[PDB]
Amino acid sequence: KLNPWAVVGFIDAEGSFMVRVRKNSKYKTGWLVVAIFSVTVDKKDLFLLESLKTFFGGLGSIKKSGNSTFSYRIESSEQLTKIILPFFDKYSLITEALGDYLLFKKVLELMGTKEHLTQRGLEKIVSLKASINKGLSEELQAAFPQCVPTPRPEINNKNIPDPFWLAGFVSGDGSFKSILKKSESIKVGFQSILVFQITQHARDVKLMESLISYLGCGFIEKDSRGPWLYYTVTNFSDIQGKIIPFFHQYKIIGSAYGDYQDWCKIALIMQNKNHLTPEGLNEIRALKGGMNKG
Template sequence: MRILEDLKNYFGGAGNIWKNGENTFKYKIESLELISNIIIPHFDKYPLVTQKLGDYLLFKTVVNMMKNKEHLTDQGVKKIVAIKASVNNGLSDDLKQAFSEIKPVSRPIVKNKKVPHGQWMAGFSSGEGCFKVVVAKTPNNKLKVRVLIALQITQHTRDEELMTSFITYFGCGKIEKDFRGPKLYYSVYKFAENYEIIIPFFKKYNILGVKSEDFADWCKVAELIKTKDHLTSSGLEKIREIKSVMNKGRYN
C-alpha cells in the first residue's frame, strides 16, 4: 500500500485507495477533470514503453470524446464500446450481447520499444519482477540441498520484443515462455550474473515499495552464498528463515 500512497501523493492527492481482498489494495482516479488535467499530461510527457501504450492511446481517445460530450450520443456510445473492446481484457459477456454488432477498433501498433533508462527498469521490476530464492534437493553436497537466487520478470507475450531487449540491456539472462498461457519471463539464474550485474544495478536504481524489502533479503542470501555459508547447516537454516518472509511469505 505504501507505493500506492506515494503514487497518490505524486499526483497531488488525486484519486482514492481502498482494500480489495485480503492482501490487495487498489488506487483509482475516476474524475474526468483529474484524468484530463493530471493523468493525460503525465503520460504524454512520460510515454509508456510496453504494449500498454496502445491501451493508453485508446483510453485517451475516450477521454477526449467525453470532454466533447460525444458519450452522450448513441453514435458516441457505440464508438466507445468499440474502443473498449480492444482495451485490456475487452468487453464483458453482457456488453458483447448488448452490442453484438460492434467490431473492435484496431489497436495502435507499438514497435521497437527498449529500456529508456535505469529508473524505468527499476520501476518496471518493482511491479513485474520477482527476487526468488530456490532451495532444492541435490545429491551433490553433504547437506543434499542446493540454494540459488534468481531474478524473474514477467510480462505478456505481446511484449516479447521489449523483454528480449533486457538481455542486451543487462548483458545476461534469457527469455522463457510459459506454455500454460500468454506469458513469458526474463530470467537470470547464474549466481555470478546476479551478484555482479543485477545486485549492483538495483542498488544504484532502487526497487520501490514492499518489493524493496524482498530485494534486501535477496541480497542477504546472495552474501551467504558468496561466503559459502549456504553449505553449512546454520547458513542453510538462516537462508530458509529469510526465504520464509519473502514475496508471498511477507503477507502471511
C-alpha cells in the same frame, strides 16, 4: 518519493486502464460512460499506494478492494484529463498496456467535448472499449451489434526509456527468488539458488528480449503451457556482478524492496561460500522464511 519513470515502469507491470459503459435510463442515450485509472495491490503495499496518490497531486482515492487488497483509483474524467493524460503522454508506457492507455485517452477526449452524451460518440466509445483489455461484455456486445472494434495501436519496438523504468517494472513483474533444492551430491543436502526473474506475456517478446542486452545477462524461457515468458538469471556471478548492482542504484519500490535486501543478504552468505555449511544454510533458511511477509 517516486521517480516518474519508476511510476511508468510500475504501471506497465500492474496498472489497469478501464472504460465502463453502464445501462441507466436517466442518461439521454440510456448509458453512463465512466473512465477509471486503477492500481490494486496487497495491503502490504498500502504505503506505495499512498506515495502514488501524493505523486498524482493528492488526487483519487484508496479503498478496500478484496479481502486483503486495496485499490488506488481515479474515476473523475476531469482529473484524469488534467493529471493522468499529461503524465503518460510525456512519460510513455512501453508494454502492450500502452495500447489500452492510448484507446483510454481517446475515450477521455470524447468525454471532454461531451460527445459521450450523444449517440454517435457513445458508439465510438463502445468501439474504443471493444479493443481495451478483454473487450466488450455480453451485455454491450448485444446492445451494440453494429460497433466494429477500433484497430489496436500498432506501436513498434519500444526501448527501455530509462533505467528507472526497469526498477518500476521489476517492482511489479519481477521476482527475487531464493530456492533451497534437495541435492544428492551437496555435502549439506541442499543447493541454494538465487534466481532473478521477470514475467510477461509473450506478445511483449521484443521487450523481454531486450532485457538480455540491457542487463548484460539472462535468457528467456517460455512456459510450455502458454504465452508466458520468464526472463531469468541463474548464473550467480551475473546476480552479483550485474543484477544486484543495477537494483542497488535503481531501487525497487513497494515492500518488494525489503525482499531484494534479504536476497542480497543471501548472496553475501553465498559469496562467502557459507551456504555450503549447515549454519550458513540455516541463515539462508531464516532470511528466506522472512521474505514476502511485509
